Design a protein around this ligand. Structure first.
Ligand SMILES: Nc1ncnc2c1ncn2[C@@H]1O[C@H](COP(=O)(O)OP(=O)(O)O)[C@@H](O)[C@H]1O
Ligand SMILES: Nc1ncnc2c1ncn2[C@@H]1O[C@H](COP(=O)(O)OP(=O)(O)O)[C@@H](O)[C@H]1O
Lengths: 42, 128, 373, 50, 50, 30, 374
């Protein structure tokens, strides 16, 4: 239990590789976005 | 704790007693030899550790043994003048290729017993 | 999907904050707290006990600037609470009860720092979930590779950690207390030789601006000394806020050189290149050639022009000649940690790893050592 | 407004130089990759030769 | 003065968009080029062994 | 300076544009 | 010794001292002030003096505008400094500088051009055969009689602390603070306005300085002393001006030097002298701080106030860990300790090889001193 206590096992690296590309897509495309608006504001 | 207590009792009894007893006899023989050579210039030393603090006795002893003139000691009674005299003596030993380890002016000045005894033994063995 | 998490990077120098899944942080501002020191005479102007962050930078003439984080350690917790409140309410304008937060801190730190950080983020702000991560692991996320040794140099502390195939070797982590604040103090010391004297905490920011604008890492130290002694082509001119003009000249490449030779500061420790090489040699035999090919620079202190060539040349000199050394420095390496935080904060498989509020209630603040790292 | 305009003109024409300074090296390797692949083809032939 | 300031700065934003696009393409083909660069090495080792 | 110029470009465009857009939306809604 | 005894010249901000090496006391001590007349000249037939230098300028302060060539340890004006040196060599010591090597003192942290100009002036004009530059706190440690301790020297222009352990100095722990006797003089001159006495011109600065020298002390407890002075008039002194009026100094006796310990009285945010000494000690290594606690040496005239040693010891003991002993060593003749250390430095035979020779100056130029001195 002591070698890999901190992380869950059997996870695909392709998911992380996809997400980094998805984040870089916004930088390339220069997207306008706003932050999440609160429910109490709504 | 009991093992450590008995162990350090063994140290402070045997190690300390043997080293201290050896250095007492060794000091007495050394000071007799130094008084033997220093009768020619009419100077003598009562204590080995205290009398070598000023460094004039060491310069006179090197004058006796080498038979040649050293630089004159600076007529100063400060701490730094004592360091200057001891440094002059050690430098005079340094030109004639007498090997010394861990030897410093402050070691002689502050009165380190093992270092003073080692310097006297080196002078005895390698010069005469 | 549901509500997005918050990513907050608290370095020793400047604080950064934004929403998870974003490319760049929304709020970037210095981590200072200022209080006035002179008499106040105009009746009716209103009172203000403290100045937090950027607001303290503009009115820095009549304040005594104080840093809450010193050498990567939070010394004054009240000013940290003030900074966090300012970040949450004035910079991002979000209620902290709706969002989980992810925080960053140094590899080797006292236990009480993490315990108090967890207690503060649960007890006062009432966040539903929180997590703590090492900054350099987030740098390795930002780079996008599974294997490499990463060296992060901030304003508080420098640290190197190697990671191979997702496994981090704990005994090879090296920490060095040589950072940008020490270089700023050394620049303040060596600017005395030309006649310029900066003493108060207001002028420390001026010295920091001088260091950020007109300093560069020399490729060869003695050759640059010869060149600067021969000619006056290396001098540059800077304008003070009050209008005086100073001219640095020789001191441009002597301040950042002190990273490679810490004996200028009186420190006995080795340089950053030797620290990285020693941290590589602490690892096992089979992973060393992979660590030589994936050295990553992170943190703002590595934004001197010419740091990469000097580092590559030094490590090439120290390493055996049969292997290739490449240093990977992204142009946006200042915010790399925060970018890594975003990549971590919105993974699908990461959502099971938040420290739940119920778990904190039933475990005390000691739950952060069992989880996190 | 005029003093801001001076600075803005400085910035735009500095970046105007910088852009095609970056363009040149890109199209340099665009013509480089041709020999870099055509030599690999001959190298593969010399590989199967042995 | 307001007029040319407003024109110049949006011209600048267009031109920095172009700079970003070309820099991204450069990063593409460089990260392709290094793996192709050691592809040729593996090919040469195969040759020498045979 | 080219690395410094690229960092300046990133900080000027990407960091500032999101903050300005969020400020606009928050101001209109408030 | 077959060689000509060297000259030791100590050049502080306030007073210049000069003497022969090997002597226990300097021959010439005089204020370093240059004066120029300001009034209309009548009675044709009497003498024409362009400038008044030194002690004579202190005798005719009424008709002169008094200037200090050295302020904050930096030689702002060089012609005045040359006049001071000429009056020292020819009118005070009556010796030719071409026959004597000279020894010079300066503050630890100061511009490099000061050293270069000092060497260039004293070789090219006075034609001295050799010269050397020393740091005043090191000479204070020389004159203290010990080789290990921390020196806090505060002159009329600068304050500095250096730690030295067994002959080795730590350059990263040297601290410099620009709070000295001139700022105390200005603060006393400002706070004398409360009682109604006004001193504005440069001639009254010396009167205020004499008041500070004769009627000031450092209180052990500041708030208790303030309450005592506000309760009654048991702490009051009377000082008479040169024209006849008698002023009552009263409460200001322990408020002028208190700015030494609390610089916030002067508008500066730096720490006091006790915190500066403590911070300099903690900048050193772990093993040697115990020896630095026991060997604190006070130097300079600014530390000449009554009760400065007890107050400094009381302040440091609270800041320091309680488990060991704090000893403040204050020699009674600390005002001339720098010159005494300079005299001892020029008496050693080993020092005779460290002089900057004229041949070396002709070879390397005025840049040799940074290589040769310190
Ligand atoms: N462009 C730059 N060039 C050189 N040094 C820089 C630059 N930007 C920041 N620094 C140095 O880095 C420090 C800020 O680093 P930062 O990344 O904020 O550290 P952290 O975020 O870990 O507190 C500053 O104090 C400065 O000394
Ligand atoms: N007896 C005294 N009591 C209190 N202060 C004194 C006394 N004598 C001198 N001072 C102060 O010390 C200053 C002289 O310091 P000094 O040692 O001459 O500095 P330096 O030699 O570096 O110019 C004077 O300006 C005066 O304010």
């Amino acid at each position: 239990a002591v070698p890999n206590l901190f992380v869950p096992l059997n996870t695909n690296p392709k998911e992380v590789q996809e997400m980094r590309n998805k984040i870089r897509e916004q930088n390339l495309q220069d997207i306008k976005t706003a932050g999440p608006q609160s429910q109490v504001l709504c | 704790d009991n093992d450590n207590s008995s162990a350090r009792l063994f140290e402070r009894s045997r190690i300390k007693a043997l080293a201290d007893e050896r250095e007492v006899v060794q000091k007495k023989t050394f000071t007799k030899w130094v008084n033997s050579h220093l009768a020619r210039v009419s100077c003598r030393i009562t204590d080995l550790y205290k009398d070598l603090r000023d460094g004039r006795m060491l310069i006179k002893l090197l004058e006796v043994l080498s038979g040649e003139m050293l630089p004159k000691p600076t007529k100063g009674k400060m701490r730094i003048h004592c360091l200057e005299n001891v440094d002059k003596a050690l430098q005079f030993l340094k030109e004639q290729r007498v090997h010394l380890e861990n030897m410093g002016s402050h070691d002689i000045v502050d009165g380190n017993h093992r270092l003073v005894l080692g310097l006297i033994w080196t002078i005895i063995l390698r010069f005469q | 999907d549901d509500i997005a998490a918050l990513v907050v990077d608290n370095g020793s120098g400047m604080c950064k904050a934004g929403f998870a899944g974003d490319d760049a942080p929304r709020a970037v501002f210095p981590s200072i707290v200022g209080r006035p020191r002179h008499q106040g005479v105009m009746v009716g102007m209103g009172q203000k006990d403290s100045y937090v962050g950027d607001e303290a930078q503009s009115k820095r003439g009549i304040l005594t600037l104080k840093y809450p984080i010193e050498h990567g350690i939070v010394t004054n917790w009240d000013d940290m609470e003030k900074i966090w409140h300012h970040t949450f309410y004035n910079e991002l304008r979000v209620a902290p009860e709706e969002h989980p937060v992810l925080l960053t801190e140094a590899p080797l730190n006292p236990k009480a720092n993490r315990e108090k950080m967890t207690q503060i983020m649960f007890e006062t702000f009432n966040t539903p979930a929180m997590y703590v991560a090492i900054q350099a692991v987030l740098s390795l996320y930002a780079s996008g590779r599974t294997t490499g040794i990463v060296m992060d140099s901030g304003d508080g502390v420098t640290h190197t950690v190697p990671i191979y195939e997702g496994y981090a070797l704990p005994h090879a982590i090296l920490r060095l207390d040589l950072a940008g604040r020490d270089l700023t103090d050394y620049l303040m010391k060596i600017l005395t030789e030309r006649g310029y004297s900066f003493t108060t905490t207001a002028e420390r920011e001026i010295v920091r601006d001088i260091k950020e604008k007109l300093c560069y890492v020399a490729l060869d130290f003695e050759q640059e000394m010869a060149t600067a002694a021969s000619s006056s082509s290396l001098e540059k001119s800077y304008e003070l806020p009050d209008g005086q003009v100073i001219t640095i000249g020789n001191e441009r490449f002597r301040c950042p050189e002190a990273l490679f030779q810490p004996s200028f500061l009186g420190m006995e420790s080795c340089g950053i290149h030797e620290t990285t090489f020693n941290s590589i040699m602490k690892c096992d035999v089979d992973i060393r050639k992979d660590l030589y090919a994936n050295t990553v620079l992170s943190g703002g202190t590595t934004m001197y022009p010419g740091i990469a060539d000097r580092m590559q040349k030094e490590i090439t000199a120290l390493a055996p000649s049969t292997m290739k050394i490449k240093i990977i420095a992204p142009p946006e390496r200042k915010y790399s940690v925060w970018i890594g935080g975003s990549i971590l904060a919105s993974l699908s498989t990461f959502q099971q790893m938040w420290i739940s509020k119920q778990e904190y209630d039933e475990s005390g603040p000691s739950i952060v050592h069992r989880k996190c790292f | 407004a005029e003093s801001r305009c001076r600075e803005m003109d400085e910035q735009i024409r500095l970046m105007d130089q910088n852009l095609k300074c970056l363009s040149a090296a890109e199209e340099k390797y665009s013509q480089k990759e041709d020999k870099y692949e055509e030599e690999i083809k001959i190298l593969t032939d010399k590989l199967k030769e042995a | 003065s307001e007029g040319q300031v407003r024109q110049l700065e949006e011209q600048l934003r267009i031109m920095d968009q172009t700079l970003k696009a070309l820099m991204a393409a450069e990063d593409k083909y460089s990260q392709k080029e290094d793996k192709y660069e050691e592809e040729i090495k593996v090919l040469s080792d195969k040759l020498k062994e045979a």
